[PDB]
Amino acid sequence: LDNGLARTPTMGWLHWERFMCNLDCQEEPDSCISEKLFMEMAELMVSEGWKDAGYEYLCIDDCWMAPQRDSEGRLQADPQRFPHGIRQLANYVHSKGLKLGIYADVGNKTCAGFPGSFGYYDIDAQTFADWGVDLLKFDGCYCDSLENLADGYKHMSLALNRTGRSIVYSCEWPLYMWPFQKPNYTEIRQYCNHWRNFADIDDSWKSIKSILDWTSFNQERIVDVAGPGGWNDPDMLVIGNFGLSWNQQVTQMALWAIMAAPLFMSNDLRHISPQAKALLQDKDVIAINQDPLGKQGYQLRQGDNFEVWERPLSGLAWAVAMINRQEIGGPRSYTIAVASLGKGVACNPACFITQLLPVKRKLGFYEWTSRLRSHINPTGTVLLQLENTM
């Protein structure tokens, strides 16, 4: 979408995976979806270095709405959970130097069952602009027909544009086409800043694997469409929660960098391990994700339960990730000819190789004819950066 936004993948925090649709403020006041949750997160995004690392969008997912529209046909924030309204939350967020994201749905209802924007696109776009919203995530539930789906996504894109406010537009259009029609990404890119392709992530290695496998399976369709202003969205980072081993977390961070993915954390910033924080704030890995050239990476090789992915970067550099998918035994040795990397130009006549994950260390110069040997933990990933010089 040519609105000057998302020139690099959008970075931020999104409540959904960790907090979901928790409406019970009596029993669980500190984790229900409320204005206090978001205000506390916004404070921590500043004080704990997240904004400095690049995480600038604080995003509200489903279950912020009251069950009914107001008398003027507007969506309204839940009166008990957001008693001061969204405008005041947006102002609070803006006062911290952050941007506010919000959620809505193209059909008759949101996926959690609250009011949808079908029949109200202009009104909802105008409401969001008036409130000071900076990002809209626009979901595809309860939309009966595919032509209503596409028209809805287009209409909302145009309506947001007509407000004159700069709003990042995050779509789920291709995901909801999945069963019925081949998405046209040229068309989607024209109307959206990013688009969800695959089923919702959860806090599990099974989920990370299916997203990676669906992406490499479909890379020939989707990798080239991506670029400044328009990204594939493989869903939230779930690092710092409960279901991933340390090595599986490293794998997610490295591969979301390779994929030029938007980086939306979904975790509890109040209770996050120092290890998870350092990984999510890793400046060299973030610099790969945020590379100005914005060329999405891809799977180069798979065999013997190993996978090699690579991403072309600016300045003739390359990022390379090697994943060990064998979920038994110990660290396994993997060797690759550096002449196979970067279409044969990454290390001709030579390249300097730096390991970024799981720990940072300089590996030295590698001649075009040389071999790279690595040891990769099960379910883990080694991430490398290849450069002309150190």
Ligand X SMILES: *[C@@H]1O[C@H](CO)[C@@H](O[C@@H]2O[C@H](CO)[C@@H](O[C@@H]3O[C@H](CO)[C@@H](O)[C@H](O[C@H]4O[C@H](CO)[C@@H](O)[C@H](O)[C@@H]4O)[C@@H]3O[C@@H]3OC[C@@H](O)[C@H](O)[C@H]3O)[C@H](O)[C@H]2NC(C)=O)[C@H](O)[C@H]1NC(C)=O
Ligand Y SMILES: OC[C@H]1O[C@@H](O)[C@H](O)[C@@H](O)[C@H]1O
Ligand Z SMILES: *[C@@H]1O[C@H](CO)[C@@H](O[C@@H]2O[C@H](CO)[C@@H](O[C@@H]3O[C@H](CO[C@H]4O[C@H](CO)[C@@H](O)[C@H](O)[C@@H]4O)[C@@H](O)[C@H](O[C@H]4O[C@H](CO)[C@@H](O)[C@H](O)[C@@H]4O)[C@@H]3O[C@@H]3OC[C@@H](O)[C@H](O)[C@H]3O)[C@H](O)[C@H]2NC(C)=O)[C@H](O[C@@H]2O[C@@H](C)[C@@H](O)[C@@H](O)[C@@H]2O)[C@H]1NC(C)=O
Ligand U SMILES: *[C@@H]1O[C@H](CO)[C@@H](O[C@@H]2O[C@H](CO)[C@@H](O[C@@H]3O[C@H](CO)[C@@H](O)[C@H](O)[C@@H]3O)[C@H](O)[C@H]2NC(C)=O)[C@H](O[C@@H]2O[C@@H](C)[C@@H](O)[C@@H](O)[C@@H]2O)[C@H]1NC(C)=O
Ligand V SMILES: *[C@@H]1O[C@H](CO)[C@@H](O[C@@H]2O[C@H](CO)[C@@H](O)[C@H](O)[C@H]2NC(C)=O)[C@H](O[C@@H]2O[C@@H](C)[C@@H](O)[C@@H](O)[C@@H]2O)[C@H]1NC(C)=O
Binding residues for substrate: 172-176
DSSP-assigned beta bridge partners for residue 194 = 170, 231
Q: By rule CB under 6 A, what string of x and - marks binding of each residue 183-212 to ligand U?
A: -x-xx-------------------------
355 binds ligand Z per the rule CB under 6 A: no
* Residue from 119, 146, 275, 305 binding ligand NAG (CB under 6 A): 119
Site for ligand X in 114-173 (CB under 6 A): 161, 164, 166
Q: Which partner in ligand X, ligand U, ligand GLA, none is near 161 (CB below 5 to 8 A by kind)?
A: ligand X
Q: By rule CB under 8 A, what string of x and - marks binding of each residue 195-224 to its own copies?
A: -------xxxxxx-----------------
52 binds ligand Y per the rule CB under 6 A: no
Q: Which is nearer to its own copies, 23 or 287 (CB)?
A: 23
Which run of H or of E encompasses 158? helix 146-162
Which run of H or of E encompasses 139? strand 135-139
DSSP-assigned beta bridge partners for residue 383 = 321, 357
Radius of gyration of the chain (CA): 21
DSSP-assigned beta bridge partners for residue 309 = 299, 321
Q: Report DSSP state, residue 337.
A: E
CA angle 250–21–47, rounded 5-degree value: 55
CB atoms within 10 A of CB 79: 9
Q: Which is nearer to its own copies, 4 or 330 (CB)?
A: 330
306 binds its own copies per the rule CB under 8 A: no
Q: Which span (24-32, 65-73, 105-113, 152-160) binds ligand GLA, by CB under 6 A?
A: 105-113
The phi, psi pair for 276, rounded to 5°, reads -65, -40
Q: How far is the CB of 318 from ligand Z (least distance, A)?
A: 23
DSSP-assigned beta bridge partners for residue 355 = 361, 384
Q: Quick one: the chain helix, strand, coil %, rounded to 5?
A: 30, 25, 45
Q: Which is nearer to ligand GLA, 56 or 139 (CB)?
A: 139
C-alpha torsion angle, residues 65, 40, 49, 247 (rounded to 10): -70
Site for ligand Y in 279-318 (CB under 6 A): 298
- Nearest position to ligand V, beta carbon: 184
4 binds ligand Z per the rule CB under 6 A: yes
Contact (Cβ atoms closer than 8 angstroms) between residue 176 and residue 149: yes
The count of chain residues that interact with ligand Z, using the rule CB under 6 A, is 8
Contact (Cβ atoms closer than 8 angstroms) between residue 382 and residue 256: no
Q: By rule CB under 6 A, what string of x and - marks binding of each residue 204-223 to ligand Y?
A: ---------------xx--x
374 binds its own copies per the rule CB under 8 A: no
Query: Where does this chain bind ligand V (CB under 6 A)?
Result: 184, 186-187
Q: Which is nearer to ligand GLA, 61 or 78 (CB)?
A: 61
Q: Which partner in its own copies, ligand U, ligand X, none is near 289 (CB below 5 to 8 A by kind)?
A: none
Q: Give catalytic residues, as residue numbers.
A: 139, 200
DSSP 283-297: HHHHHHHT-TT----
- Which runs of consecutive H residues, i.e. helices, occur in 228-271? 246-258
Task: Report the SS3 class of residue 316.
Answer: coil
Closest CA to 214 of 232, 197, 193: 197
* Residue from 6, 9, 14, 19 binding its own copies (CB under 8 A): 19
Q: Which is nearer to ligand X, 193 or 249 (CB)?
A: 193
4 binds ligand X per the rule CB under 6 A: yes
Footprint on this chain of ligand X (rule: CB under 6 A):
2-4, 7, 161, 164, 166
